[model samples]
Target: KETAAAKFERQHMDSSTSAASSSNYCNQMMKSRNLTKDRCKPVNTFVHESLADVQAVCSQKNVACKNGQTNCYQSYSTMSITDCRETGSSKYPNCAYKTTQANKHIIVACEGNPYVPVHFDASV
Candidate 1:
C-alpha cells in the first residue's frame, strides 16, 4: 500500500520541470499523474522542488491547516509551484485543466516516524 507522503509526492511533486511552456501543463500533468482517473481532481498544486527540500517543510513553524488542524507547517522560503484547476466544461474521462504558476510559501501536513509532508494544505 502507498503511504500518504508517497501519495502526496506522486500527486503534487514535479521537480523535473521548473517552468511549464505548454498551456496544457495542467491537463497533461493531471492525466499523466493519474489524477484524472475515476473523476477529475477539481483543484491541485504541484511543487517544483526536491523531495528533501519539500520534506524540510515538516520542521518549519507550526500553522493551522485549512480544516483547522494544527499539525500543519509552513515553508520558510517561497517555492516555484503550479496550480491546476479544472476547467468549467471539464468532465470525467475527458478531464481538462487550467494551469497557473506562482512562487509562494507552501503549507503542508506532516506525520510518521521521519516526520515528512503528507498533505498539501495551501500556498501563500
Candidate 2:
C-alpha cells in the first residue's frame, strides 16, 4: 500500500501549478489511490503539524505589549480535537488553547519533504 506521504509527494513532485490546481490534483490522486474517506486522518495530521510549527514561530517572537495595553496573542480556547464514536458522536473532546499570544498572527512554517506555510490569525 502506498503511504499517504508517498502519494502526496509523488503527486506534488510531478506538478507545478497554483494551489487551487494542486488541490484538485491531490483530490484526484487520492481517489486514484483508493484512499477513501480515511485519507482525512493523515491529511489532518499534516495540517496540525504545520499549525504547530506556526505556533512555535509565534512563541519565539515573544509578542507582548510593553505598555500592557493590548496583548497580541492567539488563543484556541474554542478549538478541539475529537474522534467519532460508534454512535457517530464526538469522542476525546479537549478544549483548544492558543499556541501564541493574542492580537497577533503566526506563520506556520513547513520544512522537510513537504514544504508549505499557513498563517493563523489571532481572534479578538
Candidate 3:
C-alpha cells in the first residue's frame, strides 16, 4: 500500500498536467461567457499527506485533539481541524472539517489511518 505522502504526490503532482487539462478547458469556456473570476474558481483539493502535515502543525500550535470534541485550527487560506470522542463502547467517535478560503473546498478527516472523509456540506 502507498503511504499518504507517496499517494498524494503521485496523484496530484505526477499527473498535474493531465489533471489540469480539463480545468483549463473549462476556464477557457467560462471566460468566453464573461463569467466572473470568482465564478471560475477551480476545484480545490487536499491530499492525505497535506492533511497529516496540517494535523501535525496544528498539534505543534497547541491545538488539542480531545477525545470528545472538535478542535479547530485557524489559518489564512487553510484551516486544519479535528473532532474526536469515545462512545463508551467498542467504537471511537471522531469527525473533522477543513476549508480553504480561496477555493472554498471543504473536507472532513475522520477516525483511524487513511482517515475517512465526510462529504462537503457547507461553506465558511
Candidate 4:
C-alpha cells in the first residue's frame, strides 16, 4: 500500500544523481526502479532534486496534460533531470535506454488527499 507521494519519491526522485554521464544510466535505473518489470517504459524521467523541491512544483502553476486534464503543474525553478528514451532497437528483458541529462522546468500531474505528484508529465 504505497501512497502516491511515496511512490513518486521512489520512481522519480534522484537527488543523488545530479548528472548521469553514463549512457547506460537509464538502462540500469529503469530496470532497478521497477519501471521495466513487465514492459519497457518508452519515455521516462528522473528528477534530480529533493522530495521537498519536487513536491513544491505542485503548488507552482497549472497546466494541461496531453489528454487535456488540467492537474499538471510546472516547477518554478529549473531542475536537474535525466530523460530516458528507449532506442529504436531496444528489446525486452534487455531494455536499453538513451539517457540525456538536462536542466528544465518539470511538469507533473498531482492527485490525492495531500495533493502530491503522481505522474511525471514532461520537462521543458
Candidate 5:
C-alpha cells in the first residue's frame, strides 16, 4: 500500500522538467507515476519549485478544502507547475492528457502532526 506521503509525492512531485518535458507530459507522468493504474486522475497539480517551498504552504494561507477538509492551504506565490487533466476521449490503459505549464497559486491539503501536504487539490 502507498503511504499518504509517498502518494503525495507520486501525485504532486515533478521536480525536474522543462515544463513541456514532452508534449504529453501528463500522459506519461499520470501513468509512469502510477496515478493511471486504475483510472486517470482527472486533474492534478505538479509543483516545479523546491519541496521546502511547497511544504511551507502550510503556514502560508489557510483555506477550506473542496471536499470539506479543514486542513487545506494556498500558496503564497505563483509557482511553476503543470496542470494535468485527462482528455475526455481518454480510455483506460490508453489514458491521454493535456499538460499545461505555467505559474499558479496552488491549493493543497496538509496532514501529519508536523503537517505536510498530503494531497494536491488544485492550482489557481
Candidate 6:
C-alpha cells in the first residue's frame, strides 16, 4: 500500500529534472509520473528541490489550506517548480499538459506521525 506522503513524493518531487525547458515537459511528466493513468490531472506542481528541503516545510508554522484546512505549511525558501495544467482539449487516455516553470514558495498539507507533506496545496 502507498502512503499519502510517499504518493506526494512520487507526484511532486523532481530534484533531478529541475530546469525543464521542453514544451512537452508536462505532457511527458504527467504521464510518466502516473498522473495520467486514468484521467488528466487538472493542475499539479512539481517541486524541483530535494526531499529533505521539502520535508522541512512541514516544520514551519501551520497555515490554512485553500479548501479551509489548518494542516498546511509554507516553505521558507523559494524553490524551482513546474506547474502543469491540463490542456483545455485534453481527453482521457490522451492526456496533455501545459508546463509553466517558476520559482516560488511552496505550500503543502502535512499529516501523520512523521509529519511529512501529503498534498501540494499551492505556491506563492
State the RMSD for candidate 4. Answer: 1.3
Highest lDDT among the candidates is held by which one?
1
Evaluated at residue 45, the lDDT of candidate 1 is 95
TM-scores of the models, in the order given: 0.97, 0.21, 0.23, 0.92, 0.90, 0.95
| TM-score of model 2 vs. true structure | 0.21
Model 5 scores what on Cα lDDT?
Answer: 0.84
Off by over 4 Å in 5: none
Clashing pairs in 6: none
Write the number of the candidate with greater TM-score, choosing between 1 and 4.
1
Off by over 4 Å in 4: none
Ranking by TM-score: 1, 6, 4, 5, 3, 2
- On TM-score, who's better, 5 or 6? 6
lDDT of 1 at 121: 92
Residue 48's lDDT in candidate 2: 18
lDDT of each: 0.91, 0.30, 0.30, 0.87, 0.84, 0.90
Model 3 misplacement above 4 A:
12-55, 58-124
112, model 6: CA deviation in Å?
Answer: 1.3
| Worst 10 contiguous positions by lDDT, candidate 1 | 17-26
Better of 2 and 6 by lDDT: 6
**Top candidate (TM-score):** 1
**Residue pairs in clash, model 1:** none
Candidate 3 structure lDDT: 0.30
lDDT for model 6: 0.90
Model 5 C-alpha lDDT per residue in residues 20-72, reported as the tens digit of each score: 57667888778888888887778877778778888899899999999998889
Clash number for model 6?
0
